[PDB]
Structure formats: C-alpha cells, structure tokens
Design a protein around this ligand. Sequence first.
Ligand SMILES: CN[C@@H]1[C@@H](O)[C@@H](O[C@@H]2[C@@H](O)[C@H](O[C@H]3O[C@H]([C@H](C)O)[C@@H](O)[C@H](O)[C@H]3N)[C@@H](N)C[C@H]2N)OC[C@]1(C)O
Ligand SMILES: CN[C@@H]1[C@@H](O)[C@@H](O[C@@H]2[C@@H](O)[C@H](O[C@H]3O[C@H]([C@H](C)O)[C@@H](O)[C@H](O)[C@H]3N)[C@@H](N)C[C@H]2N)OC[C@]1(C)O
Ligand SMILES: Cc1ncc(COP(=O)(O)O)c(CN[C@H](CCCN)C(=O)O)c1O
Ligand SMILES: Cc1ncc(COP(=O)(O)O)c(CN[C@H](CCCN)C(=O)O)c1O
Lengths: 349, 349
Amino acid sequence: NTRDALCKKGDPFFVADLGDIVRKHETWKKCLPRVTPFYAVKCNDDWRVLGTLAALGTGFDCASNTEIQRVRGIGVPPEKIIYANPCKQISHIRYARDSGVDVMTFDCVDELEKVAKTHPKAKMVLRISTVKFGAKVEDCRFILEQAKKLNIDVTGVSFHVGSGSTDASTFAQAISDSRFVFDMGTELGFNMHILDIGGGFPGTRDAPLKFEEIAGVINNALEKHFPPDLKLTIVAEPGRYYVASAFTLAVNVIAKKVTQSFMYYVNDGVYGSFNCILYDHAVVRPLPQREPEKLYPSSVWGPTCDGLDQIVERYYLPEMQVGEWLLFEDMGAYTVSPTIYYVVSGLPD
Amino acid sequence: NTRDALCKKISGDPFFVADLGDIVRKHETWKKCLPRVTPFYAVKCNDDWRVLGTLAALGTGFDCASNTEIQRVRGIGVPPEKIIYANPCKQISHIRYARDSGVDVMTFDCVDELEKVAKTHPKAKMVLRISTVKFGAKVEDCRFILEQAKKLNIDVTGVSFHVGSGSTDASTFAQAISDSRFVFDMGTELGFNMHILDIGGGFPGTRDAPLKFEEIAGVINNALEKHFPPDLKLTIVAEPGRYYVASAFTLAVNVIAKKVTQSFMYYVNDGVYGSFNCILYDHAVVRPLPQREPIPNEKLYPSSVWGPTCDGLDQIVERYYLPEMQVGEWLLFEDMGAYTVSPTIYYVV
Ligand SMILES: CN[C@@H]1[C@@H](O)[C@@H](O[C@@H]2[C@@H](O)[C@H](O[C@H]3O[C@H]([C@H](C)O)[C@@H](O)[C@H](O)[C@H]3N)[C@@H](N)C[C@H]2N)OC[C@]1(C)O
Ligand SMILES: CN[C@@H]1[C@@H](O)[C@@H](O[C@@H]2[C@@H](O)[C@H](O[C@H]3O[C@H]([C@H](C)O)[C@@H](O)[C@H](O)[C@H]3N)[C@@H](N)C[C@H]2N)OC[C@]1(C)O
Ligand SMILES: Cc1ncc(COP(=O)(O)O)c(CN[C@H](CCCN)C(=O)O)c1O
Ligand SMILES: Cc1ncc(COP(=O)(O)O)c(CN[C@H](CCCN)C(=O)O)c1O
C-alpha cells in the first residue's frame, strides 16, 4: 500500500504506485481493445514509469529529441515510438532519423518541406484541428497535394481534443473528420493506414466526464467510420490517463501563521511539483497524514518569496503544526525537487 | 557590443548573450540615485555565476532566500556578513544551514518564525518585515510581535518591507518608509537595538517601465530624509533584483518552423517551459526582434511566436508585426535577464 510507505516514514517526497499504472493499462485494453496506446512521455518521464509502461507492451509518444533519446535508452525499439510533434527543429528531425524513428506528425506544407530535405522516407501522419496545432479540413486537400509534389509518404491522420472536455462528442466529430481526410489521402494514392486519436483521457474519477463514457463514444464513432481492418492500425497518445493517480506527494509544513483561519507554508510549490497549477490548470486538495476535529479555513503556500507561489486558497483543514506532513494525491501528471519512491501494490511477485 | 557579437557566432540552439558591463553601469546609477542605500542583490532574480561575481566585485551585498542561494553566494568567496537571509518563513534545517554558514541576519513577520529562531539560531540579528497577503506583518500586530520577541529574547535589529514591481505610483515607497519609522520606534521603545532599514526591491530593470527608477529614488530619498535622517548608527539597505540584470541579458532563439494563412506564425526552440516561464511567473511581456537588421518600407505582417512544446499554452508572442521570417533565421528578445534563468549563456564584458 502507499497509504503506509508514507505512514511508515523533512524534505518533500513522491510516493509512486507503479501498480496503479498496471491497473490503468488493463482498464485501457478493456475499454479500448482496438486502440494501441503510445504514452505521451511529456506527461511524466519518470524512469520506472517508462519502464513499467514498456513492459506492459505500450508504445511511446515522444515530442522531442531528448524524449526519444530517453525512451530509446530503456531498450525500447524505434518502431514503438511516434515523434508526435507537428513543428520539429531540423536537427531534431535529423536525430529521429538517425535513431530509427520513422513516424512523425505534421499539420502544414512547411513541415513537409523540412521533412523532404531531412527525412524523406518518413511515414508522416497528418494531424487535423479539433489554434497552435492541427490543419483545418478545408486546407487538407491542398496540403496532401503538396505532400504529393514533395513525394511524402503520408500514412495516416491524427487529432487531439485535449483534457478540457465536458462533452465526448468532440471525439466523435474528430473521428468522423479523420475518415474524410483519410479518404482524400487514399484518393490521392496515399497509403492511409494509421489513425491516431491523441490524448486527453481522464486520469482520475475526480473529473465528471468518465474515461468509460468516452471510450464508449469513441468505439461507436470508430465503428461507424473505421470498421475493423487488418490493414488499419488505430493508436492514441494518452498522457495523464496512465500516471495522474499513481503519484502521491508528501510535503512538510515548514511554518504557520494564525489569525480563526490558518496559513501553512510547505517546502514545495509552484516553482516545482506545483507548477501544474499554472501550466496545467491543476486544482489540488491538501490531505493531512493524520488520522481524522474542528476544521478551519486554511491556505497553503510554497516556500518561495513569490506571492504567487500559493498552492491552496481556502480549504478547511484541522489545525496543523510545523513539522507535520501534508499530502497531495493525483500528482503524477505534468508535475515532475521531491525524490521519488515507488510502491507496487496488489500484484503477484 | 552585443548587438553585434551575436552578429559574430551566428557563423541552431538558442543562446543568451549577457553584457556584464550593463550591470556595472546599473550599479554606478544606483550609487548615484541612492547613495545612502546599500544594495543586497536578490539572487533569486538571476543566479548566473558571472552575474554574482560581477556584483560581488562591485562591492554589493546579496539577498539570499534559501539554503542553496546562500551556499552559492558563499561559494564565490563572498563573506557571510554581506548576506541577508531575507526569507520570512524559513525551514528549520535551512535556518540551521544559515547559522552554520555564519549568516546572522534574517527576516520574519510573525511570532512563530521567532519561536523557530529561538530554538535554532538564538543570537541571530532579526529584521521585522512589515506589510506594504503572503508576507509582511501588519503594523497593528507589530507591537504584540515585538513584545513576544522580547519574551523570546530575540535580537531584533530593524525593519523591512517590499512593494514589488507592480507599482504605478512611488508613493507606496514613501508610505512604507513612514510606517517603518513607526515600527522602528516601537522596537527602540522596547529596548530593541533598531539600526537597520531594508527598503526591499521592485526597482525597474528596463527602460520600458513607465515609472522611472529615478523618480522612485527621488521619492525614496525624500521620505528617507523626513523619517530616517543620516545617522552613523543607522544602516539602510535594499534588496534589488531586476534592477541589476533585466536589461543585461539578450536571448537569441532560432525559428524552427513556420506557417502562413495575410499573417504568420513562428515556432522557436525556447518558450514558456524555459527562458519564457517569465510570461506566466513574472507577468513578462516580450518583444520579438529580428537579428537581421531592417531594410526599408519592408512589408510587415501580424505574427505570433510559439515555444517548441506540444502545449498550446506554450505561446511566446501573440500578435506582433514582423517581417516575413524564414526557418533557420534568428529572433532576438532583449531584457531577458530577470527571472528567466540551460540555453548556453555567453558573456560580453
Ligand atoms: C475526489 N478526489 C478523490 C477522493 O475520492 C480521494 O479520497 C480521499 C482519501 O484518499 C483520503 O484518505 C487518505 O488517507 C491516508 C492519508 C495518510 O491520510 C492515505 O492512505 C491516503 O492519502 C488516503 N487513503 C480521505 N481522508 C479523504 C478523501 N477525499 O481519493 C483520490 C481522489 C481520486 O483524488
Ligand atoms: C525594446 N527594448 C528597448 C529598445 O530601445 C532596445 O533598442 C532596440 C535595439 O536593440 C534594436 O537593435 C538591434 O539590432 C540588431 C538586430 C539585428 O536588429 C541586434 O543585433 C541588436 O542586439 C539590437 N541593437 C532595434 N531594432 C530596436 C530598438 N528599439 O534597447 C533595449 C531597450 C531600451 O530595453
Ligand atoms: C500530441 C499530444 N499528445 C498527447 C497529449 C497528452 O494529453 P493527456 O496527457 O491529456 O492525455 C498532449 C497534451 N499536451 C498539453 C497538456 C498541458 C500540460 N500542462 C495540452 O495542451 O493538451 C498532446 O499535445
Ligand atoms: C524580499 C524580496 N526582495 C526582493 C525581491 C526582488 O524583486 P525585484 O527583483 O523586482 O526587485 C523579491 C521578489 N519577489 C517577487 C518576484 C516574482 C518573480 N516572478 C515579487 O512579487 O516581486 C522578494 O521577495
């Protein structure tokens, strides 16, 4: 259990439950049997996390030359990597080539020009819109034609809705659109056999739109537009789905201020594990490592002199005391400063 | 010259060109506009080695806010006396490190901190920081705080405050200083040896600031005369951060990808998850600057710059008129030395 790694043992530290990942996978292979997962390394590049996912037979979605170097470092073969970054730096595209990574994405003619000059025989996937990335459908015909003139081996379509979804229809529409563009590619003599549904899948039960109400809507549309076919290969770039809940952060209360409301200061914040409050819209919940009081409105703060380095605003907590620990669960996604300790629960040695 | 030694090694990873001389000039201007105030450089702003060494040689003091910043400053030969542990709420093991390093001046703004101090660093010269939400004791609670410090046998040596850089009006400095006199007297009244006044930081580092440094030094010197007339027993200091380094750093990024629509979008190999974290953390508004001097009646078009990351939030510029650029061409960003720093850094002196 995690619930007692921590309870077994003042710098902040991470407790990572690898077993929670293995469970996330099983649930994936179940709710989306047709979709092969390519883990968005950017979400959490922890070594054990990558190795664990590797062993589970997963693929990796690298978006930079370093992520590729990292994945290739743990023995993962090039074939299992997708350089899913649309606009890539030439020296990088060059690194991918030299590393055996032949699948990359793109969303504009320009990228194709760079590819033609640097990685000609690269299997290219056309990412479509669902602001910064994704070619509009209307411009796809023109793009493909140009890829034709550039002798680019276009092997599929991809998209990404993101995690800010309230409604799963977005997945249905993006997939319908993918068929449309898929046909054009096939129409222009392009060998279209890959469908990338991206990421944005809930890593917690915390969020209203369940993973499973999503897999459902996806499988439906995936049946109405991409019926089974041995030539076809469907993948996704899940990031937070696999690691959000696997990480639990333990911070130590370093200073207090009373006034009846409290103000606690912990040794980690926005300039660290909590950069996710500013970068990823994260809303966290402080959780005492103490057994359950009169509760009072509180606020937690990072150890930094920056008045913006605030972790919690107004959360009811029991009166805490300097030196006592505070926990934050669901801190594995876009958070990794805290050493990392792993735990493998409910699993057959 | 920068404007040209950049226009030397561009003979495509991003790099910093730091003009140390711009720092030496910043100092002279300080010793001139604020002769009575000794500067303690807020290391947090930019901890570059040459920057610290340069400031050291210029006979400046250092405002460290953590155990590492102290270790760093102590590392370049700077003596403990020239350091002020200006972080109000400090982690005990840290307070312990300061002690062991000879750093005896620290700040505080609540009784609590005093308790920690009494148990860990008794003979520490403590500076009470006042309000100008996260830091700064209100004046109304200062009497009570001092009394408690008395009961704790704390050697309270002064007052401090911080208005920050979000100032439109310098009066704030005048009021904070008036308030500092008031609390200064109480300390003296309770038998406390009050002989230090810390005016904090928040002084312009760029010539783009509405509020001039010099209209500020003026208002400060005025109030400093009406409340803290010269006195050999008195010592006045400040914690300037951005003033000394903002304009000394010039960032060079390489355009790695492009897209058209008449408007343009550019992708560079650095952004919010790096040197540009200042757009999210420090309210920075940057200006892209071609490294290809201009030509004529050039046609300029609305553009946008973007970080190399898959994050749609990794946007550097929104809508800025620039000439049509081309992948492989450089883009410059000036005034990027404050709260921005591994793009390799290059130094011009
Ligand atoms: C909506 N957020 C959910 C929520 O259901 C949450 O449950 C926590 C639960 O974990 C806490 O219980 C905690 O107790 C101990 C800790 C040392 O005190 C640990 O074992 C562990 O953190 C947890 N079991 C409980 N005290 C409050 C609920 N909100 O569990 C995780 C979550 C998915 O983020
Ligand atoms: C917006 N920053 C202001 C600004 O006045 C700036 O001067 C720039 C000047 O640096 C630029 O001129 C630039 O010229 C070349 C580049 C090839 O064009 C660069 O190599 C060089 O660093 C720079 N001097 C000029 N194009 C506009 C002015 N506003 O100087 C710094 C500053 C005062 O903070
Ligand atoms: C090509 C691509 N593939 C997978 C994922 C993974 O998303 P998720 O982890 O939700 O499944 C992302 C998410 N990148 C940032 C995330 C913002 C981070 N601060 C976003 O703005 O969605 C992406 O751009
Ligand atoms: C006690 C203390 N003394 C000096 C400085 C230096 O400020 P400046 O460099 O402007 O002079 C700081 C910087 N704190 C954040 C900075 C926010 C960083 N994004 C702020 O709100 O200005 C501080 O907390």
